[PDB]
Amino acid sequence: ASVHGTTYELLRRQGIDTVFGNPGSNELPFLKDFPEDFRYILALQEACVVGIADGYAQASRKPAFINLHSAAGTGNAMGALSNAWNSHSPLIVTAGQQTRAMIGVEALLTNVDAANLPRPLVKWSYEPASAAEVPHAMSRAIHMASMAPQGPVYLSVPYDDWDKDADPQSHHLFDRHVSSSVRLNDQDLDILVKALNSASNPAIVLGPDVDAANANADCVMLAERLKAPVWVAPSAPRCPFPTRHPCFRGLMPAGIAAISQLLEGHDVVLVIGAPVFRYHQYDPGQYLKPGTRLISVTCDPLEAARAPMGDAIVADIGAMASALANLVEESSRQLPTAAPEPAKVDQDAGRLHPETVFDTLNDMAPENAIYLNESTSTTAQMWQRLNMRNPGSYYFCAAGGLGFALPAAIGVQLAEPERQVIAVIGDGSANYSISALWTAAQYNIPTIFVIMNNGTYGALRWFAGVLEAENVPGLDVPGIDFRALAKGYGVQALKADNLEQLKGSLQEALSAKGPVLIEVSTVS
Amino acid sequence: ASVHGTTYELLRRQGIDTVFGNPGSNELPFLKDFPEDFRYILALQEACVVGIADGYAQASRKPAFINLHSAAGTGNAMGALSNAWNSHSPLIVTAGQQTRAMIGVEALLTNVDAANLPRPLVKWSYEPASAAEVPHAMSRAIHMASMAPQGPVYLSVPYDDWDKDADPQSHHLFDRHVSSSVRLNDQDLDILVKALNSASNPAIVLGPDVDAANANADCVMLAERLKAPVWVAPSAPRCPFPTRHPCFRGLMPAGIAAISQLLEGHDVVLVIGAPVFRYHQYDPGQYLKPGTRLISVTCDPLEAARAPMGDAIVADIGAMASALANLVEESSRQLPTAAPEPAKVDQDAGRLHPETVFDTLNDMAPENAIYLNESTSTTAQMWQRLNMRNPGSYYFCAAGGLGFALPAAIGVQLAEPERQVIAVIGDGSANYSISALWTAAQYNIPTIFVIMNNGTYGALRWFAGVLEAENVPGLDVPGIDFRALAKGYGVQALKADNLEQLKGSLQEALSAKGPVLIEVSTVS
Amino acid sequence: ASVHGTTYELLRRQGIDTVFGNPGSNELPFLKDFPEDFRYILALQEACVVGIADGYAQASRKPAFINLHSAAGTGNAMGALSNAWNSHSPLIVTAGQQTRAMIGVEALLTNVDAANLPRPLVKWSYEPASAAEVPHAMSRAIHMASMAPQGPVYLSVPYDDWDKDADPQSHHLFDRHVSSSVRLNDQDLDILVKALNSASNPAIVLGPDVDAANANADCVMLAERLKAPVWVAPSAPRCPFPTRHPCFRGLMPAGIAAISQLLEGHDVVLVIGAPVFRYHQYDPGQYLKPGTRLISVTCDPLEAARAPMGDAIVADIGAMASALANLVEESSRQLPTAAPEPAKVDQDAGRLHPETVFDTLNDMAPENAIYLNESTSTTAQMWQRLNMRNPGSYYFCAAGGLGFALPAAIGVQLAEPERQVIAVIGDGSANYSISALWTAAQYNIPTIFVIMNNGTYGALRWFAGVLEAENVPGLDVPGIDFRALAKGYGVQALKADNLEQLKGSLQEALSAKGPVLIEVSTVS
């Protein structure tokens, strides 16, 4: 058997059937004779390739396979990997290396010191010492990406390895099943449960890993039993709780002071599947107000280590959420009252306010719609005006790296063909991975792209204010015709300069059979 | 003064007055109060930012300053840096870090293990241990990028450093002048000169570093004195010799066997400013045929070390070229006869043959035009059909990383306002850094983009044929409207489906006052 | 031929004939059938192996070859490499890797992520992608270590590579000659020479690289022509000037303020072959007093970049020293007056004062003796009381890493069999690489070890006093019998509790035919 054959067998046996990539000569020996049980998804640029795969992996809750071209290709995807790292996305990144016979002279396309290139943005980076080792190395890649805490991995393979003979003993790799579905031991778990049962005024903070583990339901239960309010950890990469459940209290602002203020009065704060805490703006203060004790359940040792306060338990979020939900007692306290609906902002017949757009989307989008957010200055209003009842309904660049939403929305839509994906992207953000649109058109992936156009890097103008910065260059991005760009890549385009047009566009997009981009004129 | 003030003073004192970047919050403290003697060039995506700066640096022959946003921003430019590394481009890459007070918890936007991120694609990567150290660190960055062998450097700075007080002793950094303009010692230089004077049938091979050092003229002289043929080293990132000079013998094919064959019969082969040798395709054979001795003059120790044959001298290409040109004796041998003009290929009234395009470009483009090449399957014909008489007239992604030409052409044009830049880019390559177009429009940089559209990854289909590799997915890129894309970013667009239209388009583009993109229908 | 045969051929052809190492199974395939024209020097511990090789390389002024055992072996030598890096020691460090067939499972002895292990203490670190590449990789190692700035390199080789067939084209590696013997271009050199000729009160500061390039003589000339005082850069790893020459002004204290004070009044300060400046203690002040201009000639770009002041020229120290010495005019100024002999300290009939020891050594040691210093609290008196007239007469751990002197002295003695090597080592320092003594005994290398025994980490106690730091543990090292330790490794031992015994011991050691260790009772 060839390394080629054995590797594809390993891949299918491990459940992989899709390859996201952008071809190069170093990868031809791998891509040739592409198995009929596999499908290839092409993207015009590596940032888009990984972005799409990322969305696919996050939504499908299974690892995604990627194939890039040597250093340059890997390099173009580094930004995307920074996000994947923060979202614990199980991505298997493979890149073609020059033929071993020419790595020495460093012939064009030689990935020099390869394994070090994607570092420190991957859980594991490696290049086999021989062709027969490739299948084994691939096995390691697959599991390193899948084990908690999930994350991106990198494997570099010289192109002349594929045709070489594979080690017969490689078949032992095919059905290996590795599990990390673990939870705190019984004795210690009871101690925790008792603490929760004793809490006089508990509070729960949920992170992206909850949604990744599809522990949403269990968390809803846990929250109802403890009759506690639920917040989403700051800089939320995903939505781990139904935003209209009586317990939900929204997205926590990414500030130290802001959060300790919010948690004040709560004797026990239980954080699940989130870093403690992904702060953003500099909002100095107390990590926790006196009287508040924090307990963190994370799937990542690195998260537990850097938490500046509280205790931590490193385990599987799904296993823990389930266990806790079924052990805590039903508190006799009154279930929290649902937060009131947000106020309806004034809206004339001109350019739209973000609030108006979200309110409209909320009214017209299907209940199981999936949103992606890369409209950097409107995140707060968005989290308040969109009723997301189900899991996997929200995605935001986990590392703040723009250029994620657009390609990722295509991946998500590819993973969830039965759920309408709607990506709300700022006019500035839309440019980073604009070429991703082509993939949606080509494979007819019905993603809807709502471009919020205010002609400026809104969020930055905001920070400029708080940072009290003046004469800052490059904050405006005028002169971009998104309908023209959509046309450039074969995607139906619509324009919405006012509320009536927005409604009309949305209605048309919703019923359209292919991808659709709507350029919305928003207020600065 | 502040770290902010002192740094800008250091920058201007070191000749820097332009900042290429894409803003983020971590960089606001640095960009605020932007000095009036500086200019900011905004690009919609980091790959474009570095690409533009790269072209600017290569053409201006002076370092270029870049400002990116934390990890994600740096990550998006990794592909671009792979090229910069191969072309010895003096790029000073600076990226904003989170405020020191929040690096510990790893707040959103914290560049974790920062210095390791751009490795191994930079000569130096660093993050200061204190705010007062920033100016010094900046000084190191500037010089590390400028000293031979020039290359990209990385400096990460926590955003709260800028407002801090600078060390008064920093003024000692302002006017530091570091030189690496060195050449082989007298005794040894004479030994070399005598060897060249004794060569019965010498041959000269020139690399990108010759053009970078503007040693072109001196090399022409050297070639005429020795009455020797001149070749351009394989995978040429730049053109180091007038392509129509009687001695010129063209671009060497990137094959081991092909090159040793070419050099057979030449007793002494002098290679200047090039790696020995940037092979590409696997063309096994002898590094050198018996009877051929090789001598390499490189500015990079890494190049001299990995050369699989011949002797080497590590020194400044400019200094050496000059010295050699003035010391070698005038050989009595007959000056080589100029190569004959390439044949005119058959061309009907339909889609154009690449040859036709280049022949036309050669006839219509100004004599001091500057070309950029990212039409991967037509490089050979291009090098044969374009008469490039002057230095800095050709640029090709040094590492083979696509997405360079388009943004780089804008940088070159910005550096050479008096020379018409014409970038010939394949329809596939054009997508990688498509958003760069916006910058050309915004700053009205009159670059001309000629998109060779054959709807496929030509170079890849070719190779597929050698590998007789069949069933290779993702080799075609149909459905892209480049005129629409150009419109999307505000750039005048034209279409050329045949020779007459090509001529008309070129003529219009040439006289146009702003950037122009021409979509040319080429044969598959 | 085999990789084994071809590599040894490359080694001998490149002038290497000695292998310093400590064997392991991964290295057996390389060491078997050890060529008769090579010699192996065994050391009991890796820190000693590299230490010995380091001394050998520095004295012989040629690269030294080392062979260590996988990660653990490389690991034990990391401290030694830190010194080698600071002294620009051309060391070729090779370590045996597990067989390629077992690197995947990480069998015992697998050097994981090998190339990263010695980083950042090596100029180049690498592991070949195939057996046939080994000879080429070795070639790169040899040259990367030898080119300016010289330094240690690392090459990891799977043990199953040696028996594999070597690429026939490898013979092209055998006689490659790479040169970096370069100097500033003519035009710019004259500008420099004129500046020196115009200096009204020039000063010269010499570094270790001067002695490494054996540019001592030329510097003496240069100093006499300019009639300028000469200082040795702080933390001197070597002695670059005859310490009793009328111009010599001694070792500069490693303090910023101290040095700018020393240089005050000198309009032009020329620094050659030294970092600007290897400060040690925190002595804040001005880098240079107003009126002083500094010019640095360094062989290391990293040195030129971090210099906080002055101009710099990166070139070969030998070439530059020679050129300058023969171009500067003979100043009409009065040649500096030789510094007076140091005062003779009071010495009773008890424990000895360091001063007494040095005075005695100076009187009894041959004029071409070679000293090594690792008596951390007596460096100043030593530099004042030892008349070192010739080059390669002094060595001090370049990075301050103790455990260098003892093994290095053996290497130096092995390189200079005709010069008596005398290593003055503190009782604390002697322990770090104590086992090195065995090698001296085994190969009968007549090194003389003078242990300064005051039963305490003297230098640290000093610093403690500045910090007025009190209650610092682990500063005393009582209970060590060095004569017993010497006996343990088969080295003749002597004791000196007073001046008469010292004289007697030295006299006996000097005439002894093998290594000799003298334990000297010094005052605390």
Ligand SMILES: Cc1ncc(C[n+]2csc(CCOP(=O)(O)OP(=O)(O)O)c2C)c(N)n1
């Ligand atoms: C790759 C990358 N480059 C730069 C940034 C910094 N940045 C953060 S928000 C922002 C503005 C983008 O705004 P847009 O999406 O147009 O909408 P708005 O800010 O008005 O919400 C920028 C440039 C980033 N996060 N990622």
Ligand SMILES: Cc1ncc(C[n+]2csc(CCOP(=O)(O)OP(=O)(O)O)c2C)c(N)n1
């Ligand atoms: C960033 C990056 N991704 C992928 C590749 C691999 N690659 C090399 S040539 C090529 C084809 C691009 O072709 P195009 O420019 O459309 O024209 P051609 O000359 O090939 O017909 C590709 C995809 C690369 N070099 N760089």
Ligand SMILES: Cc1ncc(C[n+]2csc(CCOP(=O)(O)OP(=O)(O)O)c2C)c(N)n1
């Ligand atoms: C490997 C290593 N460990 C620790 C130190 C720190 N250190 C510096 S000087 C010193 C004292 C050694 O003293 P000794 O050689 O006995 O003599 P004296 O200090 O009295 O001169 C120590 C422990 C070091 N430089 N290197």
Ligand SMILES: O=C(O)[C@H](O)c1ccccc1
């Ligand atoms: O795929 C390849 O071979 C490689 O990326 C390449 C091919 C042709 C031109 C530039 C770069």
Ligand SMILES: O=C(O)[C@H](O)c1ccccc1
């Ligand atoms: O610039 C920033 O602050 C940062 O990149 C950011 C801001 C807002 C949303 C996402 C990311």
Ligand SMILES: O=C(O)[C@H](O)c1ccccc1
């Ligand atoms: O040389 C080896 O094989 C290896 O270092 C080894 C061998 C036996 C015991 C421990 C370690």
Ligand SMILES: [Mg+2]
């Ligand atoms: Mg990296």
Ligand SMILES: [Mg+2]
């Ligand atoms: Mg905007």
Ligand SMILES: [Mg+2]
């Ligand atoms: Mg094409």
Ligand SMILES: [Mg+2]
């Ligand atoms: Mg290390």
Ligand SMILES: [Mg+2]
């Ligand atoms: Mg002591």
